[PDB]
Each structure stands twice: as C-alpha cells, then as structure tokens.
C-alpha cells in the first residue's frame, strides 16, 4: 500500500499541474512526460482485488483517477493520441471496479459533472474498446443510483449517447456493456424511456437484439435488449408508428417464444412487454390471439416470480376481454 500511495501521489501531482495550466488562462502538460500511463495501469490492475480496492478507497483513489480522466479529456478532447486513449481506458477500468457495489463511489463520481460529461463524450471515441470501458462505468453508476445521480446521468445526455453508440458498435463485448447500462438507465424515469425511443433506428435495433446469436453461448444481449424493450414498452404502446416498427421486425412472435426461456429474466421481460402491447390495440390483440398467446400466457399465471405472474395475468386479461370477432364460433 506504500506503492499504491506513491502511484496516487503521482496522479494528484500531475492533475495539480494540469489544473495550474488551466487556471493560467507554463507549457501544456503532457501525460507522457510524467509517466501517467504505467501509474494508472498498475492501479487498474490492483483494483480487481477487493482488499486493494479498500486500501485505494482510504486514499481517495476513485476521486483522483476520475479527476485525471476528466482533466485529460478536457485538455485533449477526442483529438488525442494513443497514450491518452490508453490512459482513459485504464482509468475507466479502475473506475468500473471501484464503483462496483460502492454507494459512496457512485455518488462521488456522479456528483463530478465535468467528469460525467467527459465520460459521455468518450462514447464517440475511435477506440471502440474505450467505448465498452465507459459503458461499463455508466452501467455501475446507473445501478441503484440515488436521486441526484439519476438526475445527473440524465442531464449529461448519457441515454441518447449510449443508444446512438449501440447502433455503431461492431463487437459483442461493447454491445453488452452498452445495453446493460441502457437497461439500468431505462428504469430510472420516463424521459429516459422517451429518449431511447426517439433515437432513429433504436426500436428496430432493440427488436433485433431479441434474437441475437451469441457466439459465447450467453443470453446477455437478449436479456438486456429485452429489458430495455420491456422498460420502454409503456411508451411504445401509446405510439402507433413505434408499434409498427416492432410488428415488422417480428417482435410479437419472438416475445411469445421468449415465454419458454429457461431464463426468468427473458420470460419476465417478455411478460412485461406483452402486458403493455396487449393493451387497447385490436390488431396486436388479434395477432397475439392468432399465435396462441392465450394458452401460452395461461401457463405462467402460477409462477413463483411475481413479475411473470402479474404480467402474464395482465396480458391474458387484455386478450380475454378482447376476443376478436372472427373467433366468436365465427363472425
């Protein structure tokens, strides 16, 4: 922990020098000249171990690493070299580890507005790996966020930023971290739901995540995508254009198939989504009747899982109360 103490001192000294240069507005500090990259690299590596994290937190390590990330982004923006990219990656990983399950760390980082804007800005980085790193931070920050944190996460545009990011990512690891953060953020409030739905191509994209073929034998993408979809389905139900996007990307059939998943998360997400979409739309009700939704949902009403039991029963009630004309023996 003498070592950790020395690394954090180097970082704080460098930041002070940066803040001094900013306040003057004596050449512009460059991270390479103070060997910042090895310093953060080492702290990042230590941060995977829980006992080292506790040592790091005694030294205000989260605050110092965040301050470094912020001042580099401010100084060099996204018109920056690989040393700076590397630095932000290793810083971001440390912040991910340090915010995991830590009430105080999450609240501190979300109160750092400048640092928050800087994180969001990195979702446009040329390093897609850096994007994944930032989305991992935002994922943790958005889990069990207090009132002030939720407000800041919204006000710095994290949701639109993450949704836009998702549309351009080429790699599954990036998509996983980006969707996981969106899933958490989509639960915070109604404006977040609206902002997700307002991004052009987002609904079609989320529908596509419902049948993602993970080459790592995992359900993470389908879970987070279906989770986002379930959280925004309340608003989608009010908008006929948005319902139509879902229809023409085969959302309804896929959701029925989700009802049979071994993942309770997938079944719960599907029940929640079907609950909302089965409300007040004759044509979606009719489509769901035609695909045998009624018996499918009836099979879940006695679930142990409270959201599957209430969602399945609510969707079933919407269908049972609106038996289509053609079903009435006929006519």
């Amino acid at each position: 922990h003498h070592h950790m103490l020395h690394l954090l001192e180097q970082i704080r000294a460098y930041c002070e020098t940066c803040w001094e240069w900013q306040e003057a507005h004596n050449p512009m500090p460059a991270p390479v000249e103070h060997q910042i990259c090895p310093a953060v690299c080492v702290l990042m590596k230590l941060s995977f171990d829980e006992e080292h994290r506790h040592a790091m937190n005694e030294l205000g390590g989260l605050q110092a690493i965040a301050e470094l990330l912020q001042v580099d982004c401010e100084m060099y923006g996204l018109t920056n070299d690989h040393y700076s990219i590397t630095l932000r990656r290793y810083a971001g990983m440390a912040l991910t580890n340090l915010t995991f399950g830590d009430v105080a760390n999450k609240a501190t980082l979300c109160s750092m507005k400048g640092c928050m804007r800087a994180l969001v800005a990195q979702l446009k980085s040329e390093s897609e790996d850096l994007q994944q790193v930032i989305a991992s931070v935002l994922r943790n920050l958005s889990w069990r966020a207090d009132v002030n944190s939720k407000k800041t996460l919204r006000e710095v545009g994290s949701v639109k930023a993450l949704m836009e990011c998702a549309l351009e990512v080429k790699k599954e690891s990036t998509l996983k971290s980006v969707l996981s953060a969106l899933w958490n953020l989509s639960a915070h409030c109604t404006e977040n739901k609206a902002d997700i739905c307002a991004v052009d191509g987002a609904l079609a994209f989320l529908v596509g995540t419902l049948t993602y073929r993970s080459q790592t034998n995992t359900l993470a993408i389908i879970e987070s995508g279906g989770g986002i979809l379930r959280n925004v389905s309340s608003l989608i139900a009010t908008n006929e254009d948005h319902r139509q996007i879902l229809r023409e990307n085969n959302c309804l059939q896929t959701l029925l198939q989700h009802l049979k998943s071994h993942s309770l998360t997938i079944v719960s997400n599907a029940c929640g989504t079907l609950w909302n979409l089965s409300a007040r739309n004759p044509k979606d009700q009719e489509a769901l009747w035609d695909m045998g939704a009624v018996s499918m949902l009836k099979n879940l009403i006695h679930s142990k899982h409270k959201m599957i039991a209430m969602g399945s029963a609510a969707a079933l009630r919407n269908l049972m109360a609106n038996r289509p004309a053609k079903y009435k023996d006929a006519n």
Partner: peptide
C-alpha cells in the same frame, strides 16, 4: 442489468 467488475 445489475453491476459488475470490469470484464
């Protein structure tokens, strides 16, 4: 989604 250490 929950939260996680960096992966």
């Amino acid at each position: 989604a929950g939260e996680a250490l960096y992966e």
